[PDB]
């Protein structure tokens, strides 16, 4: 905080803006920045929209710099604020921090109201996002990697059928090793997921909720992406698959042969993908 | 739009001359669908609601610890400044084999301000930035 204060007091002109991102559960550093900038600045602000809401009251703090005297004045303000943070004190007020706490509790309740909404209301909220005009100053939608592997609902299901046909034929031409087949089937699972979120339009919402549940669960089974018998109805040569491998072995190959664990950030990436899928960023 | 409305986005002005007293949600990542490198400048979109930030043109613009420059991209779109300064926690061990380049914010390279810089287009206040 001393370094930030010295940089801001040397660099910023009069009437300038100092924007600092900060938490609020770190109260000591918050009161210390209040101590270091409040004699320096003429204005104060706290602002935080819904995106910062984790459960710890993150916010921006905006000071407007007035006049600053000289290096004697800089040393005196820094030393006096260090003295005040030493003596368990700050320039922050009581009614100000209680209204601050009220605004944060209202923000947390409203974020819980938005996130726990029904799934058609989730669709209504996702279609009305401000990502269109302001954020697209060169901002690109977070597209999955198979979105760059396509040239062009039910034809997407035909593509998925052809893909799983090719992958099971790769499994057949493998033995005509175990973790390597699991690797190939996990990559197949991941690409089925990416093609599925390509297929997630703003109309079919059951698949939206199911894919969101698969992401939130942590793992993904191929039994959930398409059923065994439903795919074999939608397949091409199911009798060859039943003759060579069979429903027992292919049932082993769908769920437990490709149990794809994710990381945190991979789950984040696919939730961003589902959000873009609802916003109409994959079907044009 | 509802995440930046009134019961979420507030503008709490601070008390100035007070005396010295002595005292896991993965669902919200559905909204963060723009930006492949960073996803953390929706928070900075609230800063354009402040008029005093937008009334701060004709000067320098110090940016500290971005790492992706998307906040810097947005704000230098909507509030142009003459010379842009840029800082990031950057150890020099991070380089690839046989390469040599310092802190490069990924999305700021893709920004419209930077493409107006390389093409030397004047900004919306009518000057070439740096």
CB atoms within 10 A of CB B37: 16
As beta bridge partners, residue A69 has none
Q: Sign (positive/negative) of CA torsion A223, A229, A230, A235?
A: positive
Quote the crossing angle between the two packed helices A119-126 and A264-279, to the nearest 10°.
Answer: 80
CA distance B123 to chain A (A): 14
Any B CB within 8 A of A246 CB:
no
Alpha-carbon gap, residue A22 to B37, rounded angstroms: 22
To which H or E segment does residue A159 belong? helix A154-175
Per-residue DSSP letter, B15: P
CB–CB contact A44 B16 (8 Å) = yes
Alpha-carbon gap, residue A150 to A147, rounded angstroms: 6
Q: Is there a contact between A157 and A242 (Cβ–Cβ < 8 Å)?
A: no
Out of A47, A129, A278, whose CB is closest to B1?
A129
Which of A241, A226, A168 minimizes the C-alpha distance to A195?
A226
Alpha-carbon gap, residue A215 to A224, rounded angstroms: 12
The answer for A 25-54 residues in CB contact with B (under 8 A) is 34, 38, 42-54
CB–CB contact B14 A281 (8 Å) = no
Rounded to a whole number of angstroms, the distance between the first and last alpha carbons of chain B is 33
Q: Is there a contact between A202 and A242 (Cβ–Cβ < 8 Å)?
A: no
Backbone angles phi, psi at B42, to 5 degrees: -70, -30
**A178 token code pair:** 């175990």
Out of A12, A89, A136, whose CB is closest to B22?
A89
Give the distance from CA A172 to its chain's centroid: 38
Alpha-carbon gap, residue A199 to A278, rounded angstroms: 10
Half-sphere exposure of A63 (CA within 13 A, CB side): 25
For residue A90, give the 3-state DSSP assignment: strand
CB–CB contact B24 A267 (8 Å) = no
Per-residue DSSP letter, B62: E
Any B CB within 8 A of A147 CB:
no
Alpha-carbon gap, residue B90 to B94, rounded angstroms: 8
Residues 6+ apart with CB under 8 A from A205: A119, A120, A123
To which H or E segment does residue A65 belong? strand A59-65
CA distance B91 to chain A (A): 19
Half-sphere exposure of A251 (CA within 13 A, CB side): 6
**A200 token code pair:** 């997630």
Tell me the C-alpha to C-alpha distance, in Å, between residue A67 and each of A13, A16, A37, B55.
Answer: 8, 10, 12, 18
Per-residue DSSP letter, B95: P
Alpha-carbon gap, residue B56 to B79, rounded angstroms: 8
Contacts of B22 in chain A (CB under 8 A): 87-89
CB atoms within 10 A of CB A130: 16
* Interface size between A and B, measured as CB pairs under 8 A: 218
Q: What is the resolution of this structure in A?
A: 3.4
Give the distance from CA A279 to its chain's centroid: 15
**A138 token code pair:** 């060169």
CB–CB contact B12 A53 (8 Å) = no
Out of B4, B21, B47, whose CB is closest to A94?
B21
The answer for A 85-104 residues in CB contact with B (under 8 A) is 87-96, 99-100, 103
Backbone angles phi, psi at B84, to 5 degrees: -110, 130
Alpha-carbon gap, residue A226 to A233, rounded angstroms: 11
For residue A37, give the 3-state DSSP assignment: helix
**B25 token code pair:** 């949600």
Contacts of B73 in chain A (CB under 8 A): 137-138
Alpha-carbon gap, residue A178 to A143, rounded angstroms: 31
Contacts of A13 in chain B (CB under 8 A): 59
Alpha-carbon gap, residue B109 to B112, rounded angstroms: 8
Which of A92, A45, A37 minimizes the C-alpha distance to A66?
A37
Per-residue DSSP letter, A132: T
Q: Sign (positive/negative) of CA torsion A48, A54, A57, A63?
A: negative
Put residue A218 in one of left, alpha, beta given phi > 0 → left and psi -120 to 50 → alpha: left
Alpha-carbon gap, residue A99 to A215, rounded angstroms: 38
CB atoms within 10 A of CB B122: 11
Alpha-carbon gap, residue B84 to B62, rounded angstroms: 6
Strands B61-63 and B84-86: parallel
Residues 6+ apart with CB under 8 A from A227: none
CB–CB contact B74 A137 (8 Å) = yes
- Residue A205, burial from CB neighbour count under 10 angstroms (0-12, 13-18, 19+): middle
Per-residue DSSP letter, A19: E
CB–CB contact A139 B34 (8 Å) = yes
Out of A110, A114, A140, whose CB is closest to B35?
A140
Q: Is there a contact between A5 and A39 (Cβ–Cβ < 8 Å)?
A: no
CB–CB contact A51 B112 (8 Å) = no
Tell me the C-alpha to C-alpha distance, in Å, between residue A196 and each of A200, A207, A230.
Answer: 6, 9, 16
Q: Is there a contact between A269 and A142 (Cβ–Cβ < 8 Å)?
A: yes
To which H or E segment does residue A190 belong? helix A178-199
Alpha-carbon gap, residue B130 to B120, rounded angstroms: 9
Out of B26, B48, B60, whose CB is closest to A271?
B26
What single string gives the DSSP state of each residue in A238-262? HHHHHHHTHHHHHHHHHTTTS----
Which of A115, A264, A201, A275 minimizes the C-alpha distance to B32?
A275
Q: Sign (positive/negative) of CA torsion A129, A133, A138, A143?
A: positive
Contacts of A141 in chain B (CB under 8 A): 33-34
As beta bridge partners, residue A21 has A60
Which of A237, A6, A59, A193 minimizes the C-alpha distance to B14?
A59
For residue A114, give the 3-state DSSP assignment: helix
CB atoms within 10 A of CB A170: 13
- Vertex B52: Cα angle to A48 and B103 (nearest 5): 70
Which of A112, A12, A137 minimizes the C-alpha distance to A54?
A112
- Rg of chain A in Å (alpha carbons): 28
Tell me the C-alpha to C-alpha distance, in Å, between residue A194 and each of A181, A199, A202.
Answer: 20, 9, 16
Give the distance from CA A133 to its chain's centroid: 20
**B35 token code pair:** 């930006």
């Amino acid at each position: 905080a001393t370094n930030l204060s010295l940089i801001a007091m040397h660099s910023v002109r009069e009437g300038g803006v100092v924007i600092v991102k900060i938490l609020y559960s770190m109260g000591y550093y918050f009161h210390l920045l209040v101590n270091l900038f409040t004699p320096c600045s003429v204005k104060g602000y706290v602002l935080s929209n819904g995106y910062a809401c984790r459960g710890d009251m993150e916010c921006y703090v905006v000071f407007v710099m007035g006049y600053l005297g000289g290096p004697t004045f800089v040393n005196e303000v820094v030393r006096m604020a260090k003295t005040l943070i030493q003596r368990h004190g700050t320039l922050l007020a009581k009614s100000d921090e209680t209204a601050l706490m009220a605004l944060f509790t209202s923000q947390k309740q409203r974020v819980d109201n938005i996130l726990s909404s029904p799934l058609p209301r989730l669709a209504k909220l996702l279609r009305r996002n401000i990502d269109t005009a302001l954020i697209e100053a060169g901002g690109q939608p977070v597209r999955p990697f198979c979105a760059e592997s396509l040239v062009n609902i039910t034809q997407t299901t035909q593509v998925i059928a052809s893909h799983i046909d090719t992958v099971i034929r790769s499994v057949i031409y493998m033995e005509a090793i175990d973790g390597k087949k699991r690797t190939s089937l996990k990559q197949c699972t991941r690409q089925i997921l990416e093609v599925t979120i390509l297929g997630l339009g703003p109309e079919d919402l059951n698949r939206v909720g199911d894919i969101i549940s698969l992401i939130l669960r942590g793992t993904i089974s191929l039994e959930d992406l398409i059923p065994l018998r439903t795919y074999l109805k939608m397949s091409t040569c199911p009798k060859y698959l039943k003759s060579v491998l069979g429903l027992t072995k292919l049932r082993e190959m769908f769920s437990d042969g490709s149990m794809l664990y994710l990381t945190r950030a991979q789950q984040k990436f696919y939730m961003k993908t589902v959000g873009n899928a609802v916003k109409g960023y994959y079907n044009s | 739009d509802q995440l930046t409305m009134k019961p979420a986005a507030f503008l709490h002005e601070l008390d100035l001359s007070a005396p010295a007293r002595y005292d896991d949600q993965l669902v919200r990542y559905l909204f963060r669908g723009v930006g492949t490198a960073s996803s953390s400048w929706y928070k900075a979109s609230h800063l354009l609601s402040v008029p005093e930030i937008r009334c701060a043109r004709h000067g320098n613009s110090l940016y500290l610890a971005e790492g992706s420059g998307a906040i810097m991209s947005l704000l230098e779109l909507h509030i142009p400044h003459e010379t842009i300064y840029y800082n990031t926690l950057f150890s020099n061990e991070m380089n690839p084999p046989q390469r040599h380049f310092g802190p490069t914010p990924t999305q700021f390279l893709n920004s419209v301000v930077y493409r107006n810089l390389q093409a030397e287009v004047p900004c919306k206040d009518g000057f070439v930035q740096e």
